[PDB]
Design a protein around this ligand. Structure first.
Ligand SMILES: CC(C)C[C@@H]1CCO[C@@H]2[C@H](CN[C@@H]2C(=O)N[C@H]2[C@H]3O[C@H](SC[C@H](F)C/C=C\[C@H]2C)[C@H](O)[C@@H](O)[C@H]3O)C1
Ligand SMILES: [Mg+2]
Ligand SMILES: [Mg+2]
Ligand SMILES: [Mg+2]
Ligand SMILES: [Mg+2]
Ligand SMILES: [Mg+2]
Ligand SMILES: [Mg+2]
Ligand SMILES: [Mg+2]
Ligand SMILES: [Mg+2]
Ligand SMILES: [Mg+2]
Ligand SMILES: [Mg+2]
Ligand SMILES: [Mg+2]
Ligand SMILES: [Mg+2]
Ligand SMILES: [Mg+2]
Ligand SMILES: [Mg+2]
Ligand SMILES: [Mg+2]
Ligand SMILES: [Mg+2]
Ligand SMILES: [Mg+2]
Ligand SMILES: [Mg+2]
Ligand SMILES: [Mg+2]
Ligand SMILES: [Mg+2]
Ligand SMILES: [Mg+2]
Ligand SMILES: [Mg+2]
Ligand SMILES: [Mg+2]
Ligand SMILES: [Mg+2]
Ligand SMILES: [Mg+2]
Ligand SMILES: [Mg+2]
Ligand SMILES: [Mg+2]
Ligand SMILES: [Mg+2]
Ligand SMILES: [Mg+2]
Ligand SMILES: [Mg+2]
Ligand SMILES: [Mg+2]
Ligand SMILES: [Mg+2]
Ligand SMILES: [Mg+2]
Ligand SMILES: [Mg+2]
Ligand SMILES: [Mg+2]
Ligand SMILES: [Mg+2]
Ligand SMILES: [Mg+2]
Ligand SMILES: [Mg+2]
Ligand SMILES: [Mg+2]
Ligand SMILES: [Mg+2]
Ligand SMILES: [Mg+2]
Ligand SMILES: [Mg+2]
Ligand SMILES: [Mg+2]
Ligand SMILES: [Mg+2]
Ligand SMILES: [Mg+2]
Ligand SMILES: [Mg+2]
Ligand SMILES: [Mg+2]
Ligand SMILES: [Mg+2]
Ligand SMILES: [Mg+2]
Ligand SMILES: [Mg+2]
Ligand SMILES: [Mg+2]
Ligand SMILES: [Mg+2]
Ligand SMILES: [Mg+2]
Ligand SMILES: [Mg+2]
Ligand SMILES: [Mg+2]
Ligand SMILES: [Mg+2]
Ligand SMILES: [Mg+2]
Ligand SMILES: [Mg+2]
Ligand SMILES: [Mg+2]
Ligand SMILES: [Mg+2]
Ligand SMILES: [Mg+2]
Ligand SMILES: [Mg+2]
Ligand SMILES: [Mg+2]
Ligand SMILES: [Mg+2]
Ligand SMILES: [Mg+2]
Ligand SMILES: [Mg+2]
Ligand SMILES: [Mg+2]
Ligand SMILES: [Mg+2]
Ligand SMILES: [Mg+2]
Ligand SMILES: [Mg+2]
Ligand SMILES: [Mg+2]
Ligand SMILES: [Mg+2]
Ligand SMILES: [Mg+2]
Ligand SMILES: [Mg+2]
Ligand SMILES: [Mg+2]
Ligand SMILES: [Mg+2]
Ligand SMILES: [Mg+2]
Ligand SMILES: [Mg+2]
Ligand SMILES: [Mg+2]
Ligand SMILES: [Mg+2]
Ligand SMILES: [Mg+2]
Ligand SMILES: [Mg+2]
Ligand SMILES: [Mg+2]
Ligand SMILES: [Mg+2]
Ligand SMILES: [Mg+2]
Ligand SMILES: [Mg+2]
Ligand SMILES: [Mg+2]
Ligand SMILES: [Mg+2]
Ligand SMILES: [Mg+2]
Ligand SMILES: [Mg+2]
Ligand SMILES: [Mg+2]
Ligand SMILES: [Mg+2]
Ligand SMILES: [Mg+2]
Ligand SMILES: [Mg+2]
Ligand SMILES: [Mg+2]
Ligand SMILES: [Mg+2]
Ligand SMILES: [Mg+2]
Ligand SMILES: [Mg+2]
Ligand SMILES: [Mg+2]
Ligand SMILES: [Mg+2]
Ligand SMILES: [Mg+2]
Ligand SMILES: [Mg+2]
Ligand SMILES: [Mg+2]
Ligand SMILES: [Mg+2]
Ligand SMILES: [Mg+2]
Ligand SMILES: [Mg+2]
Ligand SMILES: [Mg+2]
Ligand SMILES: [Mg+2]
Ligand SMILES: [Mg+2]
Ligand SMILES: [Mg+2]
Ligand SMILES: [Mg+2]
Ligand SMILES: [Mg+2]
Ligand SMILES: [Mg+2]
Ligand SMILES: [Mg+2]
Ligand SMILES: [Mg+2]
Ligand SMILES: [Mg+2]
Ligand SMILES: [Mg+2]
Ligand SMILES: [Mg+2]
Ligand SMILES: [Mg+2]
Ligand SMILES: [Mg+2]
Ligand SMILES: [Mg+2]
Ligand SMILES: [Mg+2]
Ligand SMILES: [Mg+2]
Ligand SMILES: [Mg+2]
Ligand SMILES: [Mg+2]
Ligand SMILES: [Mg+2]
Ligand SMILES: [Mg+2]
Ligand SMILES: [Mg+2]
Ligand SMILES: [Mg+2]
Ligand SMILES: [Mg+2]
Ligand SMILES: [Mg+2]
Ligand SMILES: [Mg+2]
Ligand SMILES: [Mg+2]
Ligand SMILES: [Mg+2]
Ligand SMILES: [Mg+2]
Ligand SMILES: [Mg+2]
Ligand SMILES: [Mg+2]
Ligand SMILES: [Mg+2]
Ligand SMILES: [Mg+2]
Ligand SMILES: [Mg+2]
Ligand SMILES: [Mg+2]
Ligand SMILES: [Mg+2]
Ligand SMILES: [Mg+2]
Ligand SMILES: [Mg+2]
Ligand SMILES: [Mg+2]
Ligand SMILES: [Mg+2]
Ligand SMILES: [Mg+2]
Ligand SMILES: [Mg+2]
Ligand SMILES: [Mg+2]
Ligand SMILES: [Mg+2]
Ligand SMILES: [Mg+2]
Ligand SMILES: [Mg+2]
Ligand SMILES: [Mg+2]
Ligand SMILES: [Mg+2]
Ligand SMILES: [Mg+2]
Ligand SMILES: [Mg+2]
Ligand SMILES: [Mg+2]
Ligand SMILES: [Mg+2]
Ligand SMILES: [Mg+2]
Ligand SMILES: [Mg+2]
Ligand SMILES: [Mg+2]
Ligand SMILES: [Mg+2]
Ligand SMILES: [Mg+2]
Ligand SMILES: [Mg+2]
Ligand SMILES: [Mg+2]
Ligand SMILES: [Mg+2]
Ligand SMILES: [Mg+2]
Ligand SMILES: [Mg+2]
Ligand SMILES: [Mg+2]
Ligand SMILES: [Mg+2]
Ligand SMILES: [Mg+2]
Ligand SMILES: [Mg+2]
Ligand SMILES: [Mg+2]
Ligand SMILES: [Mg+2]
Ligand SMILES: [Mg+2]
Ligand SMILES: [Mg+2]
Ligand SMILES: [Mg+2]
Ligand SMILES: [Mg+2]
Ligand SMILES: [Mg+2]
Ligand SMILES: [Mg+2]
Ligand SMILES: [Mg+2]
Ligand SMILES: [Mg+2]
Ligand SMILES: [Mg+2]
Ligand SMILES: [Mg+2]
Ligand SMILES: [Mg+2]
Ligand SMILES: [Mg+2]
Ligand SMILES: [Mg+2]
Ligand SMILES: [Mg+2]
Ligand SMILES: [Mg+2]
Ligand SMILES: [Mg+2]
Ligand SMILES: [Mg+2]
Ligand SMILES: [Mg+2]
Ligand SMILES: [Mg+2]
Ligand SMILES: [Mg+2]
Ligand SMILES: [Mg+2]
Ligand SMILES: [Mg+2]
Ligand SMILES: [Mg+2]
Ligand SMILES: [Mg+2]
Ligand SMILES: [Mg+2]
Ligand SMILES: [Mg+2]
Ligand SMILES: [Mg+2]
Ligand SMILES: [Mg+2]
Ligand SMILES: [Mg+2]
Ligand SMILES: [Mg+2]
Ligand SMILES: [Mg+2]
Ligand SMILES: [Mg+2]
Ligand SMILES: [Mg+2]
Ligand SMILES: [Mg+2]
Ligand SMILES: [Mg+2]
Ligand SMILES: [Mg+2]
Ligand SMILES: [Mg+2]
Ligand SMILES: [Mg+2]
Ligand SMILES: [Mg+2]
Ligand SMILES: [Mg+2]
Ligand SMILES: [Mg+2]
Ligand SMILES: [Mg+2]
Ligand SMILES: [Mg+2]
Ligand SMILES: [Mg+2]
Ligand SMILES: [Mg+2]
Ligand SMILES: [Mg+2]
Ligand SMILES: [Mg+2]
Ligand SMILES: [Mg+2]
Ligand SMILES: [Mg+2]
Ligand SMILES: [Mg+2]
Ligand SMILES: [Mg+2]
Ligand SMILES: [Mg+2]
Ligand SMILES: [Mg+2]
Ligand SMILES: [Mg+2]
Ligand SMILES: [Mg+2]
Ligand SMILES: [Mg+2]
Ligand SMILES: [Mg+2]
Ligand SMILES: [Mg+2]
Ligand SMILES: [Mg+2]
Ligand SMILES: [Mg+2]
Ligand SMILES: [Mg+2]
Ligand SMILES: [Mg+2]
Ligand SMILES: [Mg+2]
Ligand SMILES: [Mg+2]
Ligand SMILES: [Mg+2]
Ligand SMILES: [Mg+2]
Ligand SMILES: [Mg+2]
Ligand SMILES: [Mg+2]
Ligand SMILES: [Mg+2]
Ligand SMILES: [Mg+2]
Ligand SMILES: [Mg+2]
Ligand SMILES: [Mg+2]
Ligand SMILES: [Mg+2]
Ligand SMILES: [Mg+2]
Ligand SMILES: [Mg+2]
Ligand SMILES: [Mg+2]
Ligand SMILES: [Mg+2]
Ligand SMILES: [Mg+2]
Ligand SMILES: [Mg+2]
Ligand SMILES: [Mg+2]
Lengths: 275, 48
RNA sequence: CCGAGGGUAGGGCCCGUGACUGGGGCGAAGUCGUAACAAGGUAGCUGUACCGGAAGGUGCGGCUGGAU
RNA sequence: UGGGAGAGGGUGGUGGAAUUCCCGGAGUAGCGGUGAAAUGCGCAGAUACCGGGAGGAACGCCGAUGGCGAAGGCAGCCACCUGGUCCACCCGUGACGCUGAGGCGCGAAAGCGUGGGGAGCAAACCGGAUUAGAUACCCGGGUAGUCCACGCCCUAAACG
RNA sequence: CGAUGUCGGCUCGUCGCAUCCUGGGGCUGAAGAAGGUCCCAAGGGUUGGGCUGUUCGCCCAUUAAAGCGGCACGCGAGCUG
RNA sequence: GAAUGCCGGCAUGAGUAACGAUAAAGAGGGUGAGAAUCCCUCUCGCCGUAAGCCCAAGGGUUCCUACGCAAUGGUCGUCAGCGUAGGGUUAGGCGGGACCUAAGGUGAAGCCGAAAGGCGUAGCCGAAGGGCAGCCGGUUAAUAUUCCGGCCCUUCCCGCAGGUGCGAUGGGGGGACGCUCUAGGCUAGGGGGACCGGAGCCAUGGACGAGCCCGGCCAGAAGCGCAGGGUGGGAGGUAGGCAAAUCCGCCUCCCAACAAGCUCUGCGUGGUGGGGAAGCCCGGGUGACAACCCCCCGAAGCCAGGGAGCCAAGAAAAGCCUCUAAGCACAACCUGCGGGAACCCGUACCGCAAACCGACACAGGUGGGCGGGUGCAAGAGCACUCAGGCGCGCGGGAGAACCCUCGCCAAGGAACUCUGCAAGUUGGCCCCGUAACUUCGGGAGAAGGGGUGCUCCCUGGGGUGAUGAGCCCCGGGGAGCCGCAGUGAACAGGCUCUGGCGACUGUUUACCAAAAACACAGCUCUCUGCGAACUCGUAAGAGGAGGUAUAGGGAGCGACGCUUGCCCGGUGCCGGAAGGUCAAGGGGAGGGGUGCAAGCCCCGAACCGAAGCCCCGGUGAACGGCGGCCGUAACUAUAACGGUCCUAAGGUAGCGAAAUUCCUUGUCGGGUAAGUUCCGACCUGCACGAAAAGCGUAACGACCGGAGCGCUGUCUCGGCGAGGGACCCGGUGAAAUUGAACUGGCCGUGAAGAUGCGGCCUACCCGUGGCAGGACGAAAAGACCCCGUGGAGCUUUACUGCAGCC
RNA sequence: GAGCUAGCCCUGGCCAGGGUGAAGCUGGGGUGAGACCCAGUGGAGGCCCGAACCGGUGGGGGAUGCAAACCCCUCGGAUGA
């Protein structure tokens, strides 16, 4: 439920902030946080390899449990729902009856005080995690492993989910957040429900400095540069593209497909994405 | 106005020091050349 | 002290007028088409939307004040 | 107090028919369309037929000259929440009534905002016909929209 | 071309006369007044403003008149820009 | 003898410019061969959120003392950051190391690369971050939290006592954290005192006073007090914290809970140890048995790991505590106490500057802390002042032009000019009051006005204290006084109307452009299913991201509002298992060479044979593009209408002489006495037009345009005055430039603009202050222009390669 | 060679004083319940004014400079990109 501001500054006109109404705890679990090495887009050579990065707020990384088949059959209680600055989803704190404490991505609907459980036997309930094969067809699911025991890979951002469409041998057919239809192996785990905080996409950053807080440095158009810099650079006055619109490195950037031709996973993609 | 030389003993020893030169093929050629030329100092002085 | 009024500054309402511009009314015999009245030759009207020299047309939903 | 009928409203489920698209099979010289055609589609294998799948929308028969609502309006089926209303008994209150400038709420369609959805249909638009013309009627396409949520708009041959 | 700074303005002048005014004339289709045209004449004079970077030009208000040209389209080791 | 030659020397310019902030000097005494310049005294001025004081860098003896003055010092010099010599820097507690980790760096394992080398988990290094024990005073010419004095403390070793399951690089707890706002209580610091201490003072008309002037504290162990921080206790279960665990985590039960207790800091007090002014007298002595007290103000510092709110969600590791494992429980560890032990490096001095970075004793640059008082609403602003530190290392005169910086100006008031450029005006606070428009915030300090000192009287509330007095803080009313004038000095908006552009705050060409440019939230297209795409790299490996389509890359557009039309023929991209073409390879009809021959060797057609291209489609917020001629209405004119050619389609809405309009100062209207600019219209748009977005838009802008009011030395049109220079004298003393010079005007001549040639004219020799017409003056081997089969950046459907991708 | 300058990473530090007065909260009003209104409290913001600090808009000076970019007056930001 995005929060608005009155227009008492030029920027407060349009700025919207998340309501934080599901958050029940506001400092993280000390045993589950570790320092997040900020990069600024620089690789091990020190070269910028992803432009316009750096300068964002400091962050601690919350270790997230993307396996859950770690602890089959062991119920846990949802102790808290917490803000995670490293991802769009919120995160839920789990207290296992083990005494072990872990973080999961917080699905929509999940409540503090309810219990979740992982395993082939687990009830089909929001927050439980089962192998894909034991989830009934038609079930909305998130935090999906792409390959068995390799870790949850798909549908992790706020509001996203995959839907189960059917089974075909050892595999299930998922409709991913992108609308692609893909065969994912049935022993891959998934968590029942959609990821929460679906209002994330309606946040209006509102001002330039808000992008700066997030580590996003200003992005400068090719058309603003010189020919030394960019295909779209130069010209007297403004200039249209004057050639097929291109990236700084010369490749076409309006339509040109880029998935590797002979990639082995093509056997498992049924239909490319939609809209 | 702020000029270009802003001395700093740690910066000097770590950039041009003896150990910086020995760590690298190019740096060792520097020491080799300055020895062959007979330089009284192979490396800049800094008071550490 | 108050004080006719004069001065300075800023408001409100009304009247007249203005390059140009909007449509309206009227005007014996102009130009274009033929929308409506017969099922008016696509039943008509309608609120709305979009479009078209023009009347109009078309979409959606409504009315019979529609014929057979 | 005790009963009844009902597409009255809201929510969430869920059932089959049909259209479209995808896949597999089978099969070949046309299909479609009209007043007649053409555009379109089809040997790069269409149409027609069979099995599988996805998805949206609308609910055939019952169905009526029917029923419900204050009106706008409401139609598969199920459950829940809820309004109105009628009848019987003649039990309670004791005129506590009628209307109602303002106010408030409701208000078909189209339209608007933000998300979502999108099968069919279809303003705009394109093409094919027709015609003196044809910014139409007819044909092949087709974007909004038609659908859902929330928020607006507040119109009507909102009529008996 | 081992550089002769380029438009306009400002400042400062000085010169020519094919004279705008003022002085002297002849002719007039010169009654007077006022003009026209030509001759002599360079002593002095030849305004303020609106517009534009402007030179120029148009306009306002005047004036005896609001001259036209040369001086590296006078003048940036004088200024402006 | 020339090369703007090279090296050196020495001239010219010239006793010229200058002598480095306009904070400022004068006199007496002394020293000395010599004194504006050194020392001392008195007087004057300057800084005082510094121009004072303390750290950190960097510098490296510059520190102190004696003896010196050749050079260095912009003059002088007896002086000096200079020369010579001697002296000077003292630590278990300050800083760093024998402690910890951060980025990063390095790197057993391992990975990769022709070589060189590149990576890389642990580990190691790495600090201004974490951690850790010293405060006050005295002393030296020069060091001091270092020496000394007083009072405190830390670790290591060993011993004694008491206690305990002791024991770790392993487990756990803790360390451990943001931004804004902020409570209570304190401290630093400060103000006042009619109280306490003090050498003295009475002046010049008055004052012997509840007079003036000076000072009225600092550190301190335990204990105690005040204020805070941290922290539940017990039991039972237990499968998690990669072994174990009595610890931690999770479950349950009992009790405690805005407490308390325990613990830990801060402040206060505290044995004790110190300090102690003016003034006077020669840094010292005295004052002095110095006194050392009360009230008020009060932090941004402390208690602190405090509290609240918010979103952008805020290091690590060790010290420390707890758990246990090998082990070992004659040990070991814990607590107390005692004795012993306690290393290396730095320490001088400068440090907003004459000692650092700028070639200079250079008006520039340099991070942290302290930074007193009064008044002005506040404040680190401003004026003046304390402590402290300076008068800026050439002076003395004069009182021209001219220049700079500054003050004023009769009448006028933008007439100045490209332009109100510049300079006026306005200016703080309190109160009254405030428009279109608007996105309801704003526009707004709109505009425009009134008030402002001092005195007396009456009075309201708050803080401290006690509820009072005193002190302190916000006020209210009445009556008066003075001046030209009361934010009386200093610091402190001119305003309005209307266009263009850009939404806005931001960013930029270091050193000629700050803007309309870039960025920006927002909108759209597009790629990307994760070992993602993309990027850097030969690779390994990284980034992307410990992210996962509500995400990430690329591209354009640029808040917001209302919108974004038609063309897919060409180019691009997307789809298309057919067909055409298509390399290596397959195939081998059929030939050829050689050999006696078996053979060996060579050429080789059909046909099979990828991507790409052809071909069929799609696609515009992909590259792009969006017509011509002729005719027509009952006045004329003009054409709603028509004809025909052409195209892939012929520009829609909106806007338009525009940041675009050539003709052009279009035409008309407004504004002006007058308007090439401006605003409003018209539309024959040379040559607008819809995300290289179209049209608007409140608010914003050191943007660019037009107007008005206010006010002015901008101007008519200049005048006077101030200081710093210019000028003169003493000291010191450059520069570019320079073929040599005994270097005049005119009219001619000349390579076409002559001091230098001809003919005239004019002219005694040599300077000083000035002005800039000439020496085609200086400066820079023209940056425009061309030329060179000269170079370099950039582009592309130029050529040819290469990476990359297929 | 990044001791200048550009960006990023780690760790510290700094931003006098004054002004405006968002959300929320409380109370009150309102209603069937609401929305909502008013008052108080509150202290938000690439908010406002203005030092330090960071800039460099206009003009003047300087131009063999104090200075190979300085000086004076004026001006922009100053809790934030
Ligand atoms: C239509 C025009 C283009 C014709 C043109 C005009 C240019 O100038 C002349 C040329 C002929 N030669 C002339 C020439 O070269 N002037 C140069 C001058 O540069 C500076 S003046 C600072 C100026 F800002 C630069 C202006 C001029 C530079 C080039 C020197 O101090 C001067 O001595 C002098 O050298 C003719
Ligand atoms: Mg908002
Ligand atoms: Mg609002
Ligand atoms: Mg939430
Ligand atoms: Mg940790
Ligand atoms: Mg990283
Ligand atoms: Mg590395
Ligand atoms: Mg990149
Ligand atoms: Mg980057
Ligand atoms: Mg994310
Ligand atoms: Mg989150
Ligand atoms: Mg799989
Ligand atoms: Mg968004
Ligand atoms: Mg961030
Ligand atoms: Mg971004
Ligand atoms: Mg950009
Ligand atoms: Mg550009
Ligand atoms: Mg550019
Ligand atoms: Mg480059
Ligand atoms: Mg290139
Ligand atoms: Mg290029
Ligand atoms: Mg280009
Ligand atoms: Mg360009
Ligand atoms: Mg152009
Ligand atoms: Mg450009
Ligand atoms: Mg082009
Ligand atoms: Mg291209
Ligand atoms: Mg896909
Ligand atoms: Mg610099
Ligand atoms: Mg240098
Ligand atoms: Mg530096
Ligand atoms: Mg150093
Ligand atoms: Mg250092
Ligand atoms: Mg360094
Ligand atoms: Mg190095
Ligand atoms: Mg070194
Ligand atoms: Mg080598
Ligand atoms: Mg070697
Ligand atoms: Mg030697
Ligand atoms: Mg060396
Ligand atoms: Mg009167
Ligand atoms: Mg009709
Ligand atoms: Mg008809
Ligand atoms: Mg009809
Ligand atoms: Mg008809
Ligand atoms: Mg139509
Ligand atoms: Mg076939
Ligand atoms: Mg579908
Ligand atoms: Mg009864
Ligand atoms: Mg309605
Ligand atoms: Mg569709
Ligand atoms: Mg057609
Ligand atoms: Mg016909
Ligand atoms: Mg030339
Ligand atoms: Mg020369
Ligand atoms: Mg020249
Ligand atoms: Mg020259
Ligand atoms: Mg002038
Ligand atoms: Mg005359
Ligand atoms: Mg006459
Ligand atoms: Mg004359
Ligand atoms: Mg003119
Ligand atoms: Mg002209
Ligand atoms: Mg006359
Ligand atoms: Mg002339
Ligand atoms: Mg000429
Ligand atoms: Mg000419
Ligand atoms: Mg000239
Ligand atoms: Mg000239
Ligand atoms: Mg000049
Ligand atoms: Mg000139
Ligand atoms: Mg000259
Ligand atoms: Mg000259
Ligand atoms: Mg010779
Ligand atoms: Mg020379
Ligand atoms: Mg030479
Ligand atoms: Mg020579
Ligand atoms: Mg030489
Ligand atoms: Mg020489
Ligand atoms: Mg010699
Ligand atoms: Mg010499
Ligand atoms: Mg001389
Ligand atoms: Mg002289
Ligand atoms: Mg001279
Ligand atoms: Mg000089
Ligand atoms: Mg000088
Ligand atoms: Mg000064
Ligand atoms: Mg001065
Ligand atoms: Mg003297
Ligand atoms: Mg002297
Ligand atoms: Mg002397
Ligand atoms: Mg002196
Ligand atoms: Mg002295
Ligand atoms: Mg005296
Ligand atoms: Mg002071
Ligand atoms: Mg000497
Ligand atoms: Mg001397
Ligand atoms: Mg001497
Ligand atoms: Mg000597
Ligand atoms: Mg000297
Ligand atoms: Mg000097
Ligand atoms: Mg002597
Ligand atoms: Mg010493
Ligand atoms: Mg010691
Ligand atoms: Mg040791
Ligand atoms: Mg270490
Ligand atoms: Mg190895
Ligand atoms: Mg190699
Ligand atoms: Mg290191
Ligand atoms: Mg270390
Ligand atoms: Mg340290
Ligand atoms: Mg220490
Ligand atoms: Mg101590
Ligand atoms: Mg001594
Ligand atoms: Mg913590
Ligand atoms: Mg933390
Ligand atoms: Mg920290
Ligand atoms: Mg924050
Ligand atoms: Mg307080
Ligand atoms: Mg104290
Ligand atoms: Mg005080
Ligand atoms: Mg256990
Ligand atoms: Mg004493
Ligand atoms: Mg004594
Ligand atoms: Mg502070
Ligand atoms: Mg670490
Ligand atoms: Mg054992
Ligand atoms: Mg034993
Ligand atoms: Mg113990
Ligand atoms: Mg040692
Ligand atoms: Mg020392
Ligand atoms: Mg300074
Ligand atoms: Mg400092
Ligand atoms: Mg000094
Ligand atoms: Mg000096
Ligand atoms: Mg200096
Ligand atoms: Mg003040
Ligand atoms: Mg001085
Ligand atoms: Mg000074
Ligand atoms: Mg001086
Ligand atoms: Mg004189
Ligand atoms: Mg004055
Ligand atoms: Mg006066
Ligand atoms: Mg005057
Ligand atoms: Mg005036
Ligand atoms: Mg006036
Ligand atoms: Mg003017
Ligand atoms: Mg100008
Ligand atoms: Mg003034
Ligand atoms: Mg003022
Ligand atoms: Mg108005
Ligand atoms: Mg108003
Ligand atoms: Mg206005
Ligand atoms: Mg307006
Ligand atoms: Mg308003
Ligand atoms: Mg005012
Ligand atoms: Mg008053
Ligand atoms: Mg007075
Ligand atoms: Mg008076
Ligand atoms: Mg102001
Ligand atoms: Mg802007
Ligand atoms: Mg801009
Ligand atoms: Mg704009
Ligand atoms: Mg805008
Ligand atoms: Mg700002
Ligand atoms: Mg620049
Ligand atoms: Mg430049
Ligand atoms: Mg430069
Ligand atoms: Mg400039
Ligand atoms: Mg510029
Ligand atoms: Mg600016
Ligand atoms: Mg820019
Ligand atoms: Mg913008
Ligand atoms: Mg989008
Ligand atoms: Mg690469
Ligand atoms: Mg990572
Ligand atoms: Mg992106
Ligand atoms: Mg926009
Ligand atoms: Mg932009
Ligand atoms: Mg349109
Ligand atoms: Mg096309
Ligand atoms: Mg096409
Ligand atoms: Mg195409
Ligand atoms: Mg092929
Ligand atoms: Mg083109
Ligand atoms: Mg084209
Ligand atoms: Mg026009
Ligand atoms: Mg325009
Ligand atoms: Mg144009
Ligand atoms: Mg024009
Ligand atoms: Mg023109
Ligand atoms: Mg005109
Ligand atoms: Mg007019
Ligand atoms: Mg206009
Ligand atoms: Mg026209
Ligand atoms: Mg474009
Ligand atoms: Mg353009
Ligand atoms: Mg476009
Ligand atoms: Mg509007
Ligand atoms: Mg605007
Ligand atoms: Mg505006
Ligand atoms: Mg601006
Ligand atoms: Mg700005
Ligand atoms: Mg600006
Ligand atoms: Mg003057
Ligand atoms: Mg003077
Ligand atoms: Mg003399
Ligand atoms: Mg001399
Ligand atoms: Mg000398
Ligand atoms: Mg000679
Ligand atoms: Mg001679
Ligand atoms: Mg001579
Ligand atoms: Mg002569
Ligand atoms: Mg000639
Ligand atoms: Mg001549
Ligand atoms: Mg001569
Ligand atoms: Mg001669
Ligand atoms: Mg001769
Ligand atoms: Mg001769
Ligand atoms: Mg001669
Ligand atoms: Mg002669
Ligand atoms: Mg003569
Ligand atoms: Mg002289
Ligand atoms: Mg002279
Ligand atoms: Mg001259
Ligand atoms: Mg001259
Ligand atoms: Mg000359
Ligand atoms: Mg010459
Ligand atoms: Mg000359
Ligand atoms: Mg040369
Ligand atoms: Mg040349
Ligand atoms: Mg040159
Ligand atoms: Mg150039
Ligand atoms: Mg040429
Ligand atoms: Mg050639
Ligand atoms: Mg040639
Ligand atoms: Mg060439
Ligand atoms: Mg080249
Ligand atoms: Mg190659
Ligand atoms: Mg690629
Ligand atoms: Mg650097
Ligand atoms: Mg740096
Ligand atoms: Mg910081
Ligand atoms: Mg600040
Ligand atoms: Mg308030
Ligand atoms: Mg609150
Ligand atoms: Mg601000
Ligand atoms: Mg203000
Ligand atoms: Mg600067
Ligand atoms: Mg400046
Ligand atoms: Mg100025
Ligand atoms: Mg210069
Ligand atoms: Mg100033
Ligand atoms: Mg400000
Ligand atoms: Mg501030």
């Amino acid at each position: 439920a995005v929060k608005k501001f009155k227009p008492y500054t030029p920027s407060r006109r349009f700025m919207t902030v998340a309501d934080f109404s599901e958050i029940t705890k506001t400092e993280p679990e000390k045993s589950l946080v570790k320092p997040l090495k900020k990069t600024g887009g620089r690789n091990n050579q020190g070269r910028i390899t992803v432009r316009f990065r750096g300068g964002g707020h400091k962050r601690l990384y919350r270790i997230i449990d993307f396996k859950r088949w770690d602890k089959v059959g062991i119920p846990a209680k949802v102790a808290a729902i917490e803000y995670d600055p490293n991802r769009s989803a919120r995160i839920a704190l789990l207290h296992y009856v083990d005494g072990e404490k872990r973080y999961i991505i917080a699905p929509d609907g999940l409540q503090v005080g309810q219990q979740v459980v992982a395993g082939p036997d687990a009830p089909i309930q929001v927050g439980n995690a089962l192998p894909l094969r034991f989830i009934p067809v038609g079930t909305v699911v998130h935090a999906v492993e792409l390959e068995p025991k390799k870790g949850a890979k798909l549908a992790r951002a706020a509001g996203t989910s995959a839907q189960i469409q059917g089974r075909e041998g050892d595999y299930v057919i998922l409709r991913l957040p992108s609308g692609e239809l893909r065969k994912v192996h049935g022993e891959c785990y998934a968590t029942v429900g959609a990821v929460g905080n679906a209002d994330h996409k309606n946040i209006v950053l509102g001002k330039a400095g808000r992008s700066r807080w997030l580590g996003r440095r200003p992005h400068v158009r090719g058309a603003a540069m010189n020919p030394v810099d960019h295909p779209h650079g130069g010209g007297e006055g403004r200039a249209p593209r004057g050639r097929p619109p291109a990236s700084p490195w010369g490749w076409q950037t309006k339509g040109l497909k880029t998935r590797k031709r002979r990639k082995p996973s093509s056997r498992f993609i049924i239909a490319r994405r939609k809209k | 106005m702020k000029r270009t030389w802003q001395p700093n003993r740690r910066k000097r020893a770590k950039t041009h020091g003896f150990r910086a030169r020995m760590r690298t093929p190019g740096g060792r050629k520097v020491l080799k050349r300055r020895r062959q030329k007979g330089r009284w100092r192979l490396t800049p002085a800094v008071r550490k």
